[PDB]
Amino acid sequence: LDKIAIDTNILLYAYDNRDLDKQDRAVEILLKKPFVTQLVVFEFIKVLERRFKMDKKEITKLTIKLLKEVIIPLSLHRDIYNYSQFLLQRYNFGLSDILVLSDSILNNCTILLSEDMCNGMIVDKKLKIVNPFL
Amino acid sequence: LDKIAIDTNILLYAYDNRDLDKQDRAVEILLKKPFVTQLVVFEFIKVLERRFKMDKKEITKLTIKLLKEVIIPLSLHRDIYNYSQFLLQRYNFGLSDILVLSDSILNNCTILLSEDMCNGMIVDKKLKIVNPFL
Amino acid sequence: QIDFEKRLGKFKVETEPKLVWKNTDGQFSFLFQNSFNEMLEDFKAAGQELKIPYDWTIYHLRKKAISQKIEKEELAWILLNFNHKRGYYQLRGEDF
Amino acid sequence: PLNEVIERQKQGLTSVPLENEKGSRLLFDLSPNDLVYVPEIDENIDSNFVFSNLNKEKISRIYKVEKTSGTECYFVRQDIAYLIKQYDAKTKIGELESQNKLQVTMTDDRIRITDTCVKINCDRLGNINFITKEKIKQIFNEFR
Amino acid sequence: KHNLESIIVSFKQNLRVINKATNYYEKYVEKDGTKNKERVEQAGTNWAIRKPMHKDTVSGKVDLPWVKVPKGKILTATRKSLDSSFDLKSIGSITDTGIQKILKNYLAFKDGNPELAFSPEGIDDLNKNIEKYNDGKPHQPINKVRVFELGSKFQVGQTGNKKGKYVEAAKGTNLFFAVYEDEKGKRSYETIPLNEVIERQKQGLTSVPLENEKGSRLLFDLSPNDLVYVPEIDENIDSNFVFSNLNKEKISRIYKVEKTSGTECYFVRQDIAYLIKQYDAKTKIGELESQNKLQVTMTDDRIRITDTCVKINCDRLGNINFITKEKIKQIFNEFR
Amino acid sequence: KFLPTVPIEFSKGFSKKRIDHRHHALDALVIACATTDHVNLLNNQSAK
DNA sequence: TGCCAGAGAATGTCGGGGAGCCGAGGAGAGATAGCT
RNA sequence: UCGUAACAGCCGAGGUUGUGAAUUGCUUUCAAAAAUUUUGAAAAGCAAUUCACAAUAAGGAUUAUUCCGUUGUGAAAACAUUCAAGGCGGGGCAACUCGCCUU
DNA sequence: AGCTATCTCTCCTCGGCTCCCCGACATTCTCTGGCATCCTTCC
Ligand SMILES: [Mg+2]
Ligand SMILES: [Mg+2]
């Protein structure tokens, strides 16, 4: 009994077509109905519009379908900025990453899945960051 | 009598002092307690960290102070993606701009104080874009 | 159940150990059955009926230790009990 | 109400709001002739999925929405077409009481369906459709 | 006359809930190869709680099936000595049913009079002859009983058996009163107990949650001895600003918080020091009503304060602080 | 003019100045405007 | 025209603002041991 | 005539919640039994008398026979405390404590 | 043996702490009412 969140890299590795095994790992991650911050949704949309040059209408269609059935979006918590400042004291992460971490924690997420952090490292004795691909 | 929202460029001109007159206009606009959407806040944070190279802690402090005193943040709406899809049928703006417009409209905002958004025309007969620097 | 390397002598976290109690498959058992049986025989000699609490054994040990030999765990129990109730140490200016 | 649905669909949004003002995420909407499954009282269904092992009991615990008013939703066991005896005002005896349908399960348990029901969608041939790894693969294989 | 009638009274406030803890402790340190005793600071983040967290009495939670439990409410229990203050009503508050039966039977045996029944002599008589009132069954003697109570109590802590002990907030620790606003226009009032405030501040957050479970935006929080302004009935306003030239009437429409309980916040006009006549409950006549506090304005309109009040912050000298065209510029200049 | 008044039963331990905080500011203003001439005239430093 | 949506009728539960009790620091009122 | 009165320090014994135990109790649940009624076993909830033990403001350091955690200042989530040597001496079997003289 | 000044023995209004209605608002199930009349084309 625990709550799981994810990061933008997981959605991208699901969408990308050059890491077939990582594609798999991503897809059976999504079979469990993970949660997402709105931040990773916005970053995913920006990356799709920027990196893959895939047009806006299809971006919106895909994200609507994903948020509708694949994933459960998380309400953007109001205490995100204060808590992000609090976590920013001792963890030397990017401000985007710490924002994701803070809003994930504030929504009672117990495990975060990603690759851009310290695998297994614990933040504020509340959340555990895991690299599911390794 | 009518709600008012702002775009990231308003905050950027309020902070940056390369053109003093536009900075004064932006400060005057901020004096009236204007509403703001969280996407604008995140874009502002990203720009400050990237363009102006301010460190994380001062950026977070500035954001917290601004939200506590100067501006009213708007809660993120659950219908942002569907409406953004709807708005794309008639209007051809950037995807981030479309998201900003959708979140502003869904929160009953009637004026969007922006600059780089081809001011003047109504949007969906609910909101209008106004350039305050002209 | 007690740390001895970093937090010296402190109980391990979320542990509430009893010295005279051993847990086996969640079943708690006394640790000094011999002295307990000695107390039962003594109370039988005194005429008191039966079925006395297990943990009275501390006082039989304390009386016994004055003249006889007791086990090392019993000695540790007695010392940790003496740590509890040091007693009153009157200072200057009072007679009582 | 139909007015809200009309306005929401005209705006391009979905028929049912994603988030009530109470601050609760929308689990699902229900329409007439929809299918729901009521799990057993003992069991806990949160991410069960696996809707191919439909035996007698699981299928027999499938209900259908019939009508709706306010916060009251009425269900009928999906295999029931005509009631054995319809309700009457004089003798006041009926197979499914005065409303000819119950807000709860028909069996002896009498548990409110809406508290534990899970929505189920099916194709024309009466086959249950649930997400699979291949479906998740294709859902954005198509956009590529 | 003008200056005296244009004065706002400044109240010193200290809302210390947590603070940094200073710990100078002596230990052996190595300098130039020699180990010497010297006092050092404590390393890390140490928080000192600056308020009495809870009351002294500690209660344990019980589950009595024969008692209806209101939602959001907790049933606890506590040992108490058996004395003459126990009547047939009091015996109904004892957790143990068999003790209730024995005690009621013995009390009836002595004319239902607690004074003789529950004197120490009566307790001794019951203890020495407990067989009669317990259906002839044996029973261990009785000296104390665990009476149960119904109320709002919270655990002392989490580690160890500190989760098994339930306490209640210390008197005078109700220091926060949140007022939230919804998009509809309705104002919601709430009181935040202390322990949540300690938790939030330890997390680095604000004292009061910025939105309640309604989702309503938080208008403002209130603590004892802060000043609010109550607008006129025909002057329904949002912020009204104009806080640099308040007239006699604007100043005269300023109220101050003293007591917060439940959803109730009690106010007295800021310039009122001592009432002409202290309220008497017997005669029900005085300058102010019961508790010498009013939730409504003194004037004849008698409008409830919490409905239209707007918080105003006042510095030491009596001035009112409001955002200006320059404070924003200093805000930006601080970070550049 | 109509001056403030308190009935006998309610006038035990009553003060006009004690009812409002502003009497402190009034006292400050009064003591401020009195010059050294005022203080050494009301202290009878010239009485002899 | 059968049946859908909502009015309609019995309940039980809860805020909430007065009624009535009632714990508690503190003042007459005095027996009394230290003092004369 | 002011001031002195405030701040600190070494200890004690309970109580409460909880864990384990000995002995009894009250209620509830399948009947195991008797000829619609009782005797009941076993569990659960609630205790009582006594014993041992854990915690005793949430919590954080440290391995000194040291602590910090209900005071004050104010955003810096930052602080307050201590301050080298030399003998002379009193006390104390001891640990150590207390004064005087000299830069 | 007699005076008194520090205790103790009992009444009080205040600050609380339960009753205490009283009206309003969920739940659960059951009645009840509903646009009707209108001709040709029109086979
Ligand atoms: Mg990331
Ligand atoms: Mg933009």
Outline the structure in words.
- The structure is cut from a larger assembly and holds two copies of chain A (134 residues) and four copies of chain C.
- By secondary structure, chain A is of the alpha/beta class.
- Chain A contains six helices and six strands.
- In chain A, the strands form two sheets. Chain A has a four-stranded mixed beta sheet with strand order 1-4-6-5, covered by helices on one side. A two-stranded parallel ribbon of chain A has the order 2-3.
- In chain A, helix 1 packs across helix 2, helix 1 crosses helix 3 and helix 5 (80-87) crosses helix 6.
- The two termini of chain A are 22 Å apart.
- Chain C has three helices and two strands; from the N terminus they run ββααα.
- Chain C has helices spanning 33-46, 57-65, 72-82; strands at 21-24, 27-30.
- Chain C is flat.
- A two-stranded antiparallel ribbon of chain C has the order 1-2.
- Chain C has 96 residues and is mainly alpha-helical.
- The chains are: A alpha/beta (134), C mainly alpha (96).
- The A-B interface holds A 38-39, 42, 45-46, 49, 56-57, 59-61, 63-64, 67, 75-76, 81-82, 84-85, 88, 95-96, 98-99 and B 38-39, 42, 45-46, 49, 56-57, 59-61, 63-64, 67, 75-76, 81-82, 84-85, 88, 95-96, 98-99.
- The site of one magnesium ion has 7 residues of chain A, from helix 1 and helix 6.
- Chain E binds three DNA and RNA strands through strand 1, strand 2, strand 3, strand 4 and strand 6.
- It is classed as dna binding protein/dna/rna.
